[PDB]
Amino acid sequence: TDTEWSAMHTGLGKTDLAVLRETMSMAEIRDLLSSSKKVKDEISTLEKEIQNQAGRNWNLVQKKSKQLAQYMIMGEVGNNLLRNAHAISRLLGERITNGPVADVAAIDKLITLYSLELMNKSDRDLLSELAQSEVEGMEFSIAYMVGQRTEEMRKAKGDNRTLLNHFKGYIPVENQQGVNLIIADDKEFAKLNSQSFTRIGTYQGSTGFRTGSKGYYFSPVAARAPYSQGILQNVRNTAGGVDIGTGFTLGTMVAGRITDKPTVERITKALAKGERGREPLMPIYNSKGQVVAYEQSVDPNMLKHLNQDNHFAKMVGVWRGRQVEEAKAQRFNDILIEQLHAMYEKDIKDSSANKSQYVNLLGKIDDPVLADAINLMNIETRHKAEELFGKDELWVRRDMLNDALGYRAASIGDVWTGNSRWSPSTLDTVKKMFLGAFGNKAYHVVMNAENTIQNLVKDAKTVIVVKAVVVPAVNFLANIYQMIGRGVPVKDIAVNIPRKTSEINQYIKSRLRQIDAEAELRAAEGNPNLVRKLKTEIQSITDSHRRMSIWPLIEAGEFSSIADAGISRDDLLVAEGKIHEYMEKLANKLPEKVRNAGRYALIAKDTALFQGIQKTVEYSDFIAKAIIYDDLVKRKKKSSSEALGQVTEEFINYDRLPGRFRGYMESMGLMWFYNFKIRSIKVAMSMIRNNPVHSLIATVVPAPTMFGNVGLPIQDNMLTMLAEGRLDYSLGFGQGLRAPTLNPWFNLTH
Amino acid sequence: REHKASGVRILSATAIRNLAKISNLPSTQAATLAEIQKSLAAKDYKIIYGTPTQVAEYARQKNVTELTSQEMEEAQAGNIYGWTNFDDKTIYLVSPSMETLIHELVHASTFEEVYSFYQGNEVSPTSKQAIENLEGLMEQFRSLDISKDSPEMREAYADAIATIEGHLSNGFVDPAISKAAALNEFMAWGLANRALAAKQKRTSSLVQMVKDVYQAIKKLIWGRKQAPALGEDMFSNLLFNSAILMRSQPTTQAVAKDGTLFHSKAYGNNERLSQLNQTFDKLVTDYLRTDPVTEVERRGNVANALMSATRLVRDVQSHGFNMTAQEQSVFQMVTAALATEAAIDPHAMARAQELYTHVMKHLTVEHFMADPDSTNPADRYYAQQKYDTISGANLVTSLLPTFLGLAMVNEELRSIIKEMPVPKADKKLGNDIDTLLTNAGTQVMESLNRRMAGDQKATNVQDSIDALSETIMAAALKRESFYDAVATPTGNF
């Protein structure tokens, strides 16, 4: 029954029963579950033995082992929680101790025996009958948990920082498909005026940290954007429920994380007096026994709303299928190191003077923030690099390394804390660019810095126009962030987009007279006076085209694939910069019964407004390739044919991918989300070949749009509300300024 | 200009101005094309022509729905006709000649006046009378006697009636679109049979009809200025042959009835809810007005009840009562039906008060706990959470309609309710409390059914119903998105 599967999940899984196989046979374990007196007898003899070794520290060892058993079952967090027996053996945060106070293995047995007594009486009765009538089934299930435990222990024992911080008795659990629970600030949430969230409680916090009023908000079943929920979306390996190397938690949800040195020392001596609150803070311990961070826990009662599943058979399959995926991503990083060594070998062989353009990564690092991230690098990749190069050797090209660190000149904040945003200088540069490219009216309704979009529309017809301008705006802004991340300087784009817009603008105007001068040539079959005038006119225009800076793109044909496919008078608005008014003109051609349906109106693929959006989208790609081509030629020193080779592999023709969704459904915003997804896959595949150093760095050095979920409550980006059809946001302030991640291997698989 | 990937050629605006001279038509009607050219060039009308294979290959590359007319019987004859796309103002021609190109310019322009008149817009006073005169003739067109006419004339009349009556008797298409299409087909029949009826025919009732409609179009085309005398050729045997493409918004009943029988493991497979949703359609959804819904602020009295009831539906699911996507939609639709009825009849919820008060006397927190003697503090918290909502503490008036709606959809609450004792006053009926609550729900909706089935305009409830149809439309499109998002055998996002 479904109740028996849940009892087995709590008994075998959450109590870490696999640790008993070190000293007891499989038949003896089945005897413990069938007799409560045996459990009480084992505790009595185990307590006496540990008391002799512990000595005067017996009171503290007993207290901390009982507190841990409370968390593993009922989820309660006490004061100064120690997550495993390795930390309890050293009594971190209680007394200064130079080693294990007692036997680590003995303490492990006592902790899991204590938590076995905390289980429900009805729950224990179910396990007793199964252990007697299903002998062959129960033994096989126990053996699976032994295999799951060894893999985690193999990764955890590699580093001492993650050895003292991994959770004991961790087993995955999944929420209900569709629901969402977040913790948000009260004042910031009020101004959004969202109509899908309900406040279900308040966040009290602890007395050691002072902050603004917070609360819990819950969202019932709905439809969410793809690749935003249901997966961990983490680019780092996890052992024991925490990140390998740092010790930060990723298998659960926390309200925040504090890592700054001056602030952490402020919390430390405030909790020495005492702690009070429903949500105490959990510390993170160093290798020497100090404290390096703090975390904000979550009330266990608020997790009941998520309707979590605890099916033992299903969650083991999720556990093993996730360990395999982590192993494959680990092996991929080893092959990249082999390629980096092969390139370094040839250059030195050709000439001994080529070593002047290489930097030792594992050696001394001058940059402090860069150096700290290097130390916490995964230990499995460190040994592989040392195997090929030598003792503390990792040489990479200096020019390729500078590109991978071009993000830090424009971003501020810390990724782990969760407050990494663009610098105010960067925003004032991007904001002025969108106003010039798009219409002035469009800027007022899209990037309003005080009000959301839904608060600025008060007519049923204006909803259709507003929902159409969003799609080109998202594509225009997404490309700017993506090219900024890849090392292109900010000041280059700021001075080149107006230059390229002007060059493109005069192209259609000049092409307009040439596109119909052939009609006059057909009517010029006669006296040479008509021919003489036409011949000079057409040749003069073409000579002007030859001198344009974007000419090489024109000859390739990709720059004029759709320019010559159709000429209309209203399309001059797009080239001028009146996109918002260009949408109104095509909106009035809709039927009266459709225009007045507002957000309920279904737009067909045959209408003129539908094809107007597609024309504008390819007009944004008009400028994207122009900037990239200059970058690969001016500051990269590449041939005019090499640059055009790379451009063709990062853009696709959208006429081959019509929507394939149901009728009677608003699939306008969902179709463009999937189209933009495929183009991101091609970009990631190109970055691997043309920049092996950047791909390896992206999973080592924290950076915005480089790491996925960090354990904090799920946050959206610009690409998320586009697919969901919402309007309670704006692309100019707060949320909505975030861009999707750029990790190459992450995008290929997720 | 010719397409690169196909032999199709494209003609845009301001490219056929000289074509007025090429046709060498009489000068009296030659100036007409100069005015027709200006009108079509103002709204960016482009012409695409080619061979049947070339024009078919172009559509596939650009994802264009074609409406070429040809059959195996017509293949032996060997004639192909194009179509016009009224949505994006594009004309498609197949193997055109000089006559057919001119005939389409005066045909597309004429249909614009018909569309504008039937959309509620304003037209020229001369055009208004011409369309009205044509409309009156169509009424008598479908009431003639063809027993005295030639056998070849009867076939032409038979085809016209069948297509004309189809547009008039259509319920799932916007009436404004259907009305214009029916009139356009009427003109085509008259122009097609002008040649064969002017000769070798008698003065029958049908014959006079052909002559009258021909003159009716003449006034519409030429406007208030002088037209050519009677019996004169229009444009060298003018004909209407291209088909039109038109689209509009679907009705509320179309999308609400589509997802009634949805069922899946990831979506919900409760059979009792699907049957409950079927009886809702008979009483409420069937009697909504057939016109497509709109989006207005709708400030009133019932509109306050629907906004309040929407918030309580969300608040219930956030305070202990989790629901699937199938249960959520039925909960929203049924509650909004009782909410609008209580805002019109103050005594609609008189019976539900007796059943609600009786239930509150025999309810305890222990009824919501699977294990009455659990040790985990979180188990007791969730049970107390559900008790408060039933007690109304969490929700903190339209509170009664929400409880009546919840008592019909939730399956865990119904198990608790059915075990309560029955009052001695209601022991005569012989029903449990759960069935008494579900029988009271249909009584409220049945009273609302009679309200919508009467004289809505005189009762001054037309605006209130327009508010109820918007809520049903919104909830129908939401369950169309969760569905198709789990359209896999595993039902995973």
PDB file of C-alpha atoms in Angstrom, chain A residues 73-74 76 118 120-123 176-179 195-200 218-224 226 229 300-302 304-307 459-461 463 515-516 518-520 522-523 564-571 589-602 604-608 611 654-658 660-666 670 674, chain B residues 1 3-4 10-15 17-18 41 43-44 46 58 61-65 85-89 115 119 174 176-177 245 247-250 254-255 258 262 266 289 291-296 311 314-315 317-320 322-325 328 371 373-379 381-382 385 470 473-474 476-478 480-486 491-493:
ATOM      1  CA  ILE A  73      12.933  12.543  11.693  1.00  0.00           C
ATOM      2  CA  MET A  74      10.810  15.568  12.643  1.00  0.00           C
ATOM      3  CA  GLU A  76      13.348  20.459  13.836  1.00  0.00           C
ATOM      4  CA  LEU A 118      11.388   8.502  17.387  1.00  0.00           C
ATOM      5  CA  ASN A 120       5.545   6.500  15.064  1.00  0.00           C
ATOM      6  CA  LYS A 121       4.208   3.446  16.877  1.00  0.00           C
ATOM      7  CA  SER A 122       1.872   2.678  13.969  1.00  0.00           C
ATOM      8  CA  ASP A 123       4.751   3.112  11.512  1.00  0.00           C
ATOM      9  CA  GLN A 176       3.826  18.297  -6.210  1.00  0.00           C
ATOM     10  CA  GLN A 177       3.891  19.056  -9.935  1.00  0.00           C
ATOM     11  CA  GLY A 178       2.616  22.613 -10.308  1.00  0.00           C
ATOM     12  CA  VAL A 179       2.830  24.160  -6.838  1.00  0.00           C
ATOM     13  CA  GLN A 195      -2.760  37.909  -8.182  1.00  0.00           C
ATOM     14  CA  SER A 196      -1.399  34.348  -7.953  1.00  0.00           C
ATOM     15  CA  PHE A 197       0.187  34.354  -4.467  1.00  0.00           C
ATOM     16  CA  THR A 198      -1.449  33.996  -1.050  1.00  0.00           C
ATOM     17  CA  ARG A 199       0.242  34.823   2.247  1.00  0.00           C
ATOM     18  CA  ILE A 200       0.134  31.782   4.536  1.00  0.00           C
ATOM     19  CA  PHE A 218       2.089  29.961  -1.813  1.00  0.00           C
ATOM     20  CA  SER A 219       0.903  29.459  -5.395  1.00  0.00           C
ATOM     21  CA  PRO A 220      -1.629  26.698  -6.216  1.00  0.00           C
ATOM     22  CA  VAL A 221      -1.486  24.337  -9.194  1.00  0.00           C
ATOM     23  CA  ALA A 222      -0.752  26.026 -12.530  1.00  0.00           C
ATOM     24  CA  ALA A 223       1.478  25.664 -15.602  1.00  0.00           C
ATOM     25  CA  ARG A 224       5.117  26.752 -15.359  1.00  0.00           C
ATOM     26  CA  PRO A 226       9.947  24.517 -18.981  1.00  0.00           C
ATOM     27  CA  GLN A 229      11.091  23.348 -11.734  1.00  0.00           C
ATOM     28  CA  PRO A 300       9.110  22.453   8.981  1.00  0.00           C
ATOM     29  CA  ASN A 301       5.377  23.197   9.203  1.00  0.00           C
ATOM     30  CA  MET A 302       5.440  25.273   6.004  1.00  0.00           C
ATOM     31  CA  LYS A 304       3.343  20.451   4.530  1.00  0.00           C
ATOM     32  CA  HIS A 305       1.676  22.625   1.878  1.00  0.00           C
ATOM     33  CA  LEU A 306       3.975  21.302  -0.862  1.00  0.00           C
ATOM     34  CA  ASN A 307       2.363  17.820  -0.706  1.00  0.00           C
ATOM     35  CA  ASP A 459      -7.955  49.153 -22.611  1.00  0.00           C
ATOM     36  CA  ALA A 460      -8.824  45.821 -24.204  1.00  0.00           C
ATOM     37  CA  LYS A 461      -7.176  46.761 -27.513  1.00  0.00           C
ATOM     38  CA  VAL A 463      -3.292  44.464 -24.468  1.00  0.00           C
ATOM     39  CA  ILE A 515      13.884  47.322 -56.420  1.00  0.00           C
ATOM     40  CA  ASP A 516      11.498  49.044 -58.860  1.00  0.00           C
ATOM     41  CA  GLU A 518      13.879  47.451 -63.248  1.00  0.00           C
ATOM     42  CA  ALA A 519      10.214  48.179 -63.990  1.00  0.00           C
ATOM     43  CA  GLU A 520      11.286  51.478 -65.553  1.00  0.00           C
ATOM     44  CA  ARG A 522      11.250  47.355 -68.912  1.00  0.00           C
ATOM     45  CA  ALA A 523       9.420  50.548 -69.911  1.00  0.00           C
ATOM     46  CA  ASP A 564      14.313  41.236 -50.819  1.00  0.00           C
ATOM     47  CA  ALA A 565      11.663  38.584 -50.075  1.00  0.00           C
ATOM     48  CA  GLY A 566       9.030  41.314 -49.698  1.00  0.00           C
ATOM     49  CA  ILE A 567       8.809  45.112 -49.754  1.00  0.00           C
ATOM     50  CA  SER A 568       6.030  47.041 -48.018  1.00  0.00           C
ATOM     51  CA  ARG A 569       5.587  50.720 -47.221  1.00  0.00           C
ATOM     52  CA  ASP A 570       4.689  50.207 -43.552  1.00  0.00           C
ATOM     53  CA  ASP A 571       7.961  48.316 -42.994  1.00  0.00           C
ATOM     54  CA  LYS A 589      -6.498  45.281 -39.406  1.00  0.00           C
ATOM     55  CA  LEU A 590      -7.775  42.607 -37.012  1.00  0.00           C
ATOM     56  CA  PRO A 591     -11.503  41.803 -36.887  1.00  0.00           C
ATOM     57  CA  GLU A 592     -13.621  43.738 -34.413  1.00  0.00           C
ATOM     58  CA  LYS A 593     -14.595  40.615 -32.456  1.00  0.00           C
ATOM     59  CA  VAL A 594     -10.909  39.682 -32.069  1.00  0.00           C
ATOM     60  CA  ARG A 595      -9.513  43.113 -31.173  1.00  0.00           C
ATOM     61  CA  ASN A 596     -11.929  43.515 -28.242  1.00  0.00           C
ATOM     62  CA  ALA A 597     -11.119  40.140 -26.658  1.00  0.00           C
ATOM     63  CA  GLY A 598      -8.014  41.573 -24.981  1.00  0.00           C
ATOM     64  CA  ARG A 599      -5.923  38.904 -23.280  1.00  0.00           C
ATOM     65  CA  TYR A 600      -8.403  36.234 -24.444  1.00  0.00           C
ATOM     66  CA  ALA A 601      -7.844  36.991 -28.140  1.00  0.00           C
ATOM     67  CA  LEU A 602      -6.299  34.164 -30.165  1.00  0.00           C
ATOM     68  CA  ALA A 604      -3.764  33.199 -36.048  1.00  0.00           C
ATOM     69  CA  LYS A 605      -0.637  32.624 -38.120  1.00  0.00           C
ATOM     70  CA  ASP A 606      -2.354  33.982 -41.256  1.00  0.00           C
ATOM     71  CA  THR A 607      -2.932  37.515 -39.943  1.00  0.00           C
ATOM     72  CA  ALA A 608      -0.672  40.462 -40.732  1.00  0.00           C
ATOM     73  CA  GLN A 611       4.006  38.131 -39.575  1.00  0.00           C
ATOM     74  CA  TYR A 654      12.659  30.580 -38.133  1.00  0.00           C
ATOM     75  CA  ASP A 655      10.453  29.823 -41.163  1.00  0.00           C
ATOM     76  CA  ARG A 656      11.203  26.097 -40.703  1.00  0.00           C
ATOM     77  CA  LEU A 657       9.682  25.899 -37.186  1.00  0.00           C
ATOM     78  CA  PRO A 658       5.982  26.770 -36.982  1.00  0.00           C
ATOM     79  CA  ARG A 660       2.916  22.678 -33.016  1.00  0.00           C
ATOM     80  CA  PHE A 661       0.628  23.289 -30.036  1.00  0.00           C
ATOM     81  CA  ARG A 662      -3.109  22.824 -29.547  1.00  0.00           C
ATOM     82  CA  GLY A 663      -5.860  25.005 -30.898  1.00  0.00           C
ATOM     83  CA  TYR A 664      -7.979  27.067 -28.510  1.00  0.00           C
ATOM     84  CA  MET A 665      -4.798  27.913 -26.594  1.00  0.00           C
ATOM     85  CA  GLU A 666      -2.585  30.993 -26.257  1.00  0.00           C
ATOM     86  CA  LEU A 670       5.334  29.715 -25.780  1.00  0.00           C
ATOM     87  CA  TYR A 674      11.238  27.144 -27.674  1.00  0.00           C
TER      88      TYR A 674
ATOM     89  CA  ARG B   1      10.437  40.150 -59.170  1.00  0.00           C
ATOM     90  CA  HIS B   3      11.329  34.175 -56.071  1.00  0.00           C
ATOM     91  CA  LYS B   4      14.696  32.442 -55.874  1.00  0.00           C
ATOM     92  CA  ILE B  10       5.631  38.940 -56.833  1.00  0.00           C
ATOM     93  CA  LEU B  11       3.920  42.194 -57.823  1.00  0.00           C
ATOM     94  CA  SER B  12       3.708  44.860 -55.125  1.00  0.00           C
ATOM     95  CA  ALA B  13       1.911  48.191 -54.828  1.00  0.00           C
ATOM     96  CA  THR B  14       2.793  51.100 -57.133  1.00  0.00           C
ATOM     97  CA  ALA B  15       3.786  48.611 -59.834  1.00  0.00           C
ATOM     98  CA  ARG B  17      -0.243  51.858 -62.480  1.00  0.00           C
ATOM     99  CA  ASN B  18       0.526  51.672 -66.216  1.00  0.00           C
ATOM    100  CA  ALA B  41      -2.312  50.550 -52.979  1.00  0.00           C
ATOM    101  CA  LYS B  43      -3.572  49.208 -47.773  1.00  0.00           C
ATOM    102  CA  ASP B  44      -0.582  47.369 -49.317  1.00  0.00           C
ATOM    103  CA  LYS B  46       0.328  42.610 -53.362  1.00  0.00           C
ATOM    104  CA  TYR B  58       5.567  28.710 -52.471  1.00  0.00           C
ATOM    105  CA  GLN B  61       7.854  27.207 -47.736  1.00  0.00           C
ATOM    106  CA  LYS B  62       6.014  30.178 -46.197  1.00  0.00           C
ATOM    107  CA  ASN B  63       3.385  28.129 -44.288  1.00  0.00           C
ATOM    108  CA  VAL B  64       0.411  29.478 -46.247  1.00  0.00           C
ATOM    109  CA  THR B  65      -3.004  27.819 -46.445  1.00  0.00           C
ATOM    110  CA  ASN B  85      -6.160  36.337 -48.273  1.00  0.00           C
ATOM    111  CA  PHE B  86      -8.181  39.096 -46.603  1.00  0.00           C
ATOM    112  CA  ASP B  87      -6.162  38.838 -43.374  1.00  0.00           C
ATOM    113  CA  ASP B  88      -2.876  40.130 -44.839  1.00  0.00           C
ATOM    114  CA  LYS B  89      -4.197  41.712 -48.081  1.00  0.00           C
ATOM    115  CA  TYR B 115     -17.023  43.909 -45.023  1.00  0.00           C
ATOM    116  CA  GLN B 119     -18.761  45.349 -39.270  1.00  0.00           C
ATOM    117  CA  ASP B 174     -18.977  35.045 -35.967  1.00  0.00           C
ATOM    118  CA  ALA B 176     -20.511  39.461 -38.862  1.00  0.00           C
ATOM    119  CA  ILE B 177     -18.122  37.258 -40.851  1.00  0.00           C
ATOM    120  CA  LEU B 245     -10.181  33.830 -46.419  1.00  0.00           C
ATOM    121  CA  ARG B 247     -11.137  34.270 -39.493  1.00  0.00           C
ATOM    122  CA  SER B 248     -12.562  35.417 -36.167  1.00  0.00           C
ATOM    123  CA  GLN B 249     -12.548  34.667 -32.453  1.00  0.00           C
ATOM    124  CA  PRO B 250     -14.117  31.377 -31.299  1.00  0.00           C
ATOM    125  CA  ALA B 254     -16.386  26.143 -28.170  1.00  0.00           C
ATOM    126  CA  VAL B 255     -13.424  26.076 -25.781  1.00  0.00           C
ATOM    127  CA  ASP B 258     -13.453  20.881 -25.516  1.00  0.00           C
ATOM    128  CA  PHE B 262      -9.978  15.457 -20.064  1.00  0.00           C
ATOM    129  CA  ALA B 266      -0.886  13.741 -14.035  1.00  0.00           C
ATOM    130  CA  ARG B 289     -25.075  34.267 -25.805  1.00  0.00           C
ATOM    131  CA  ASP B 291     -21.420  36.128 -29.604  1.00  0.00           C
ATOM    132  CA  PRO B 292     -17.716  36.011 -28.674  1.00  0.00           C
ATOM    133  CA  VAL B 293     -16.854  37.468 -25.285  1.00  0.00           C
ATOM    134  CA  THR B 294     -15.188  40.848 -24.772  1.00  0.00           C
ATOM    135  CA  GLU B 295     -13.037  42.583 -22.128  1.00  0.00           C
ATOM    136  CA  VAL B 296     -14.676  45.533 -20.350  1.00  0.00           C
ATOM    137  CA  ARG B 311     -10.147  35.204  -4.391  1.00  0.00           C
ATOM    138  CA  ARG B 314      -7.482  30.462  -4.439  1.00  0.00           C
ATOM    139  CA  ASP B 315      -7.389  31.048  -0.673  1.00  0.00           C
ATOM    140  CA  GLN B 317      -6.387  25.719  -1.843  1.00  0.00           C
ATOM    141  CA  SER B 318      -3.596  27.551   0.010  1.00  0.00           C
ATOM    142  CA  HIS B 319      -4.961  26.611   3.461  1.00  0.00           C
ATOM    143  CA  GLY B 320      -5.042  22.816   3.609  1.00  0.00           C
ATOM    144  CA  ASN B 322      -4.717  20.607  -2.218  1.00  0.00           C
ATOM    145  CA  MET B 323      -6.366  19.895  -5.564  1.00  0.00           C
ATOM    146  CA  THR B 324      -5.445  18.540  -8.976  1.00  0.00           C
ATOM    147  CA  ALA B 325      -5.791  20.482 -12.217  1.00  0.00           C
ATOM    148  CA  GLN B 328      -9.422  23.110  -9.631  1.00  0.00           C
ATOM    149  CA  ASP B 371      -3.177   8.956  12.695  1.00  0.00           C
ATOM    150  CA  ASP B 373      -2.218   9.688  18.078  1.00  0.00           C
ATOM    151  CA  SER B 374       0.737  10.865  16.003  1.00  0.00           C
ATOM    152  CA  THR B 375       3.895  12.374  17.506  1.00  0.00           C
ATOM    153  CA  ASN B 376       5.058  14.652  14.677  1.00  0.00           C
ATOM    154  CA  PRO B 377       3.856  18.206  15.476  1.00  0.00           C
ATOM    155  CA  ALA B 378       3.480  18.949  11.754  1.00  0.00           C
ATOM    156  CA  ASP B 379       0.664  16.402  11.396  1.00  0.00           C
ATOM    157  CA  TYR B 381      -0.756  21.635  12.322  1.00  0.00           C
ATOM    158  CA  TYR B 382      -2.141  20.661   8.913  1.00  0.00           C
ATOM    159  CA  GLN B 385      -5.359  24.346   9.174  1.00  0.00           C
ATOM    160  CA  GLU B 470     -15.882  36.004 -19.012  1.00  0.00           C
ATOM    161  CA  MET B 473     -13.779  31.727 -20.657  1.00  0.00           C
ATOM    162  CA  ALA B 474     -10.790  32.426 -18.403  1.00  0.00           C
ATOM    163  CA  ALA B 476     -11.456  27.161 -19.832  1.00  0.00           C
ATOM    164  CA  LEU B 477      -8.188  28.469 -21.297  1.00  0.00           C
ATOM    165  CA  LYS B 478      -6.250  27.741 -18.095  1.00  0.00           C
ATOM    166  CA  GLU B 480      -5.977  23.970 -21.870  1.00  0.00           C
ATOM    167  CA  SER B 481      -2.441  24.979 -20.820  1.00  0.00           C
ATOM    168  CA  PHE B 482      -1.819  22.469 -18.021  1.00  0.00           C
ATOM    169  CA  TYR B 483      -3.069  19.887 -20.477  1.00  0.00           C
ATOM    170  CA  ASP B 484      -0.613  19.620 -23.406  1.00  0.00           C
ATOM    171  CA  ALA B 485       2.093  20.473 -20.835  1.00  0.00           C
ATOM    172  CA  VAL B 486       2.017  16.863 -19.574  1.00  0.00           C
ATOM    173  CA  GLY B 491       3.191  12.902 -17.647  1.00  0.00           C
ATOM    174  CA  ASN B 492       6.329  14.850 -16.724  1.00  0.00           C
ATOM    175  CA  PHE B 493       7.100  18.518 -17.336  1.00  0.00           C
TER     176      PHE B 493
END
